[PDB]
Amino acid sequence: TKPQCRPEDYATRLQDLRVTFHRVKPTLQREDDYSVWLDGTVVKGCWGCSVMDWLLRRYLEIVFPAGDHVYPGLKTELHSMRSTLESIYKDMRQCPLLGCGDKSVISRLSQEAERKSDNGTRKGLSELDTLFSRLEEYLHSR
Amino acid sequence: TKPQCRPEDYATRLQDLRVTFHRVKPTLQREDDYSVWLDGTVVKGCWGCSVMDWLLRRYLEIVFPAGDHVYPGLKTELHSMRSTLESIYKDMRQCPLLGCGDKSVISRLSQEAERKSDNGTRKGLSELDTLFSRLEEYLHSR
Amino acid sequence: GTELPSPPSVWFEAEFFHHILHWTPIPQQSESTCYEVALLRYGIESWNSISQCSQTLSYDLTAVTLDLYHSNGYRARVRAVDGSRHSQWTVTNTRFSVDEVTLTVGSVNLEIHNGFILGKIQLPRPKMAPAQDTYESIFSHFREYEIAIRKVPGQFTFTHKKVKHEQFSLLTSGEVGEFCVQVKPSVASRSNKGMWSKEECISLTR
Amino acid sequence: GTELPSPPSVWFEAEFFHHILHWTPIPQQSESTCYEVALLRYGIESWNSISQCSQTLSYDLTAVTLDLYHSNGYRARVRAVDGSRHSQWTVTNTRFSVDEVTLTVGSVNLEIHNGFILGKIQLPRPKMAPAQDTYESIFSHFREYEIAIRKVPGQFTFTHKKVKHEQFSLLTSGEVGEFCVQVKPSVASRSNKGMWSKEECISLTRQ
């Protein structure tokens, strides 16, 4: 298989984040109204892959950076975590299975339709019948 | 149940597409290639909603137009099909349940994060522990 | 000089699990002349002769196309052979799939009850059909039937009535006589043509 | 009126399905003075007193935090009460969750076989733990253990050996004597601290 596809490969960074986090936990969790933003399904279900990316980007790009202003004292701890989280993200987008699956099917389809001597216009029009079945079949699936 | 949402609304147009495809079928399925581009699973599963949309746009935007250049004597039929297929597409958009269920969760999160006086930065960093658990759980589910 | 004329055309004429291949005869066909029918399944570029020498104008490919309703269709070709000579192949001009199957119904059961004619359409159950591949299974949605009714002491004129179920009712609002009905199947989203069933009649009172 | 000093601090000290709440005493505590322990679960802004008047410095919140390993954590608070008087609440300073649970091992079974010391680590099986919520179920991946071995006729010096399974082997390459081992659990991807188990020994020779 591929290493950046094995979760075993994310264990130490997962641990670093959790160890750096433990040190500053009492500060970051002071105000804390006791509400939940990231509940227990947030990243589950068919499209969790989509939510997982959104979240990670939101933190690397908005939350953490904004964090430097609200907690000037923890800037170091904050950067360390963003850094490690960044490390994890770069590795996660290197494994298809870790992201959403649609991106893979769309990719395999466009490649066949493009390795055709006519860019696949012929096979495409040739399969309008199959397409109409997939489509009707689809409408009935949900 | 909104109209554009139920399969019955697509029956007639699906049928038109096919009768029209039937009169020009021997011309379009005349080539020598007997390979299958749109396999049986292409639109099945979690990824289906996404693949379907991509196929619809692909055909509507790239293939049909390409058709006029290859089957000139068929433009009438081709324009019809591309027109019914089009009526079908826009219609399917009016129906949320027919598309990908991945935008709703992102809506809630973003919304709830905006209804905060600092845009969720605080709630965001205090849930880092939760994030790391969702991430770790997310990796073992893939 | 192996250059016999090739069959003018090759096409399918099928009904539920009755996939028959037809082709015209080659001009000047002799008595020692036969036809070779080959079959190709989409997704696997390879032809397989089903019959080497068939002295007919048709061949039942059902035994070899059972997964038609679970496939991407087949292609077919026939060529004439006379000893050591044989023409070029003539192949079907379109992909053979569920789309090209003619819809037919097995039989219609009529009954009378308190001024009602209760009808039950029995779709075809061909023996060759694998257990879980029923007409219902394959044509899972939008099954429709045209019902043509005629009164015996009436004439050869018919009145229509479309239904979306395999069961239907027609009310005998205080009428006497004999009612005969024919049924024509179709699938609202499909283009498959269907054929009228043998007329069935039933008598009201005595 | 009613202004008693509040408990200086409140914190959890927990192990697998043993969620114990601790707090310091209030200066000048009397004999008619008790403590009220309240519990709040993240996601539902509402406090519920578990105990109205507890004459102790700790309280077992396990029976009321069973879904800790399937939740978003709890918050806790304790306040002193003396008749009609009571201080402000003192609440935990962090969200109590699986993260703050200390890893412990139930026991280690040693055995000898053809020059091998075969060890089996028995993770904790607290009675309060609901059937399908086993240590293994909860900490499903990367469970690891630090093994410290010491030879009896040796001394108070230890040699390390890390393993990734609940079963392990140490070879007795023609050695004699008594071997004692201690085990320390952890989860390679987590930060949970763990505690050394009671030393266990076994004799090679007839001992």
* 3-class DSSP string for chain A: CCHHHCHHHHHHHHHHHHHHHHHHHHHHCCCCCCCCCCCCCCCCCCCHHHHHHHHHHHHHHHHHHHHHHHCHHHHHHHHHHHHHHHHHHHHHCCCHHHCCCHHHHHHHHHHHCCCCCCCCHHHHHHCHHHHHHHHHHHHHHC
CA–CA separation, D196 vs D207, rounded Å?
Answer: 26
Q: What is the DSSP string of C149-172?
A: EEETTT-S--EEEEESSSEEEEE-
**The CATH number of the domain where D84 resides is what?**
2.60.40.10
What 3 state SS string does chain B have?
CCHHHCHHHCHHHHHHHHHHHHHHHHHHCCCCCCCCCCCCCCCCCCCHHHHHHHHHHHHHHHHHHHHHCCCHHHHHHHHHHHHHHHHHHHHHHCCHHHCCCCHHHHHHHHHHHHCCCCCCHHHHHHCHHHHHHHHHHHHHHC
| A129 → closest Cβ in C95, C140, C141 | C95
In Å, what is the CA distance from C125 to each residue of C18, C106, C129, C144, D193? 11, 7, 7, 18, 68
Same domain, D5 and D96: yes
Task: Look at B18 and C190 and tell me if their CB atoms are within 8 Å.
Answer: yes
CB contact A142 to B (< 8 Å): yes
Same domain, C92 and C156: no
CA–CA separation, A81 vs A31, rounded Å?
Answer: 21
Task: Look at C189 and B15 and tell me if their CB atoms are within 8 Å.
Answer: yes
Same domain, C138 and C198: yes
CB contact B8 to D (< 8 Å): no
* Domain range summary for chain B, segments of one domain joined by +: 1-100, 101-142
Same domain, C75 and C7: yes
Q: How many domains does chain C have?
A: 2
Task: Look at D95 and A29 and tell me if their CB atoms are within 8 Å.
Answer: yes
Q: Considering D48, D71, D102, which residue would you say is the last residue of a domain?
A: D102
The answer, yes or no, to whether C and D have at least 3 beta-carbon pairs within 8 Å is no
Same domain, D116 and D59: no
**Alpha helix (H) ranges present in chain C?**
135-138
Nearest to D43 by CA among D93, D97, D89, D88: D97
Full residue range of the structural domain in which residue C180 is found:
103-205
CA–CA separation, C160 vs C147, rounded Å?
Answer: 6
Task: Look at A129 and C72 and tell me if their CB atoms are within 8 Å.
Answer: no
Same domain, D152 and D170: yes
Q: What is the DSSP string of D43-110?
A: TS--EEEEEEEE-SSEEE-GGG-GGGGGSS-EEEEEEEEETTEE---EE-SS-BSGGGEEB--SEEEE
How was this model experimentally determined?
X-ray
Same domain, D112 and D144: yes
Are the C-beta atoms of D133 and D69 separated by less than 8 Å?
yes
CB contact D176 to A (< 8 Å): no
Same domain, C127 and C200: yes
Helix pair B128-141, A48-58: axis angle to 10 deg: 140
Q: Considering C102, C136, C154, which residue would you say is the last residue of a domain?
A: C102
**Resolution to 1 decimal place, in Å:** 2.7
CA–CA separation, B118 vs B104, rounded Å?
Answer: 22
Tell whether domain B101-142 is in CATH 3.20.20.70.
Answer: no
Show residues of chain B in contact with D140, CB under 8 Å: 140
Query: Which residues is D76 bridged to in the sheet?
Result: D39
Query: Which residues is D160 bridged to in the sheet?
Result: D148
| B126 → closest Cβ in A28, A118, A123 | A28
Cα Rg of chain C (Å, integer): 22
Residues 6+ apart with CB under 8 A from B111: none
Are the C-beta atoms of A49 and A101 separated by less than 8 Å?
yes
Q: Considering D102, D135, D168, which residue would you say is the last residue of a domain?
A: D102
Task: Look at B125 and A18 and tell me if their CB atoms are within 8 Å.
Answer: no
In Å, what is the CA distance from C97 to each residue of C70, C114, C143, D44, D112? 9, 44, 18, 58, 69
Same domain, C148 and C173: yes
- C73: nearest CA in chain A? A130
Same domain, D48 and D124: no
Same domain, C35 and C95: yes
Same domain, D113 and D92: no
- Give the side-chain half-sphere CA count within 13 A for D8: 7
| D190 → closest Cβ in A15, A38, A40 | A15
CA–CA separation, C179 vs D2, rounded Å?
Answer: 95
Other Cβ atoms within 10 Å of B6 Cβ, number = 14
Nearest to D78 by CA among D47, D45, D100: D47
CA–CA separation, C103 vs C101, rounded Å?
Answer: 6
CATH of domain A1-100: 1.20.1250.10
Show residues of chain B in contact with D97, CB under 8 Å: 129
Task: Look at D191 and A18 and tell me if their CB atoms are within 8 Å.
Answer: yes
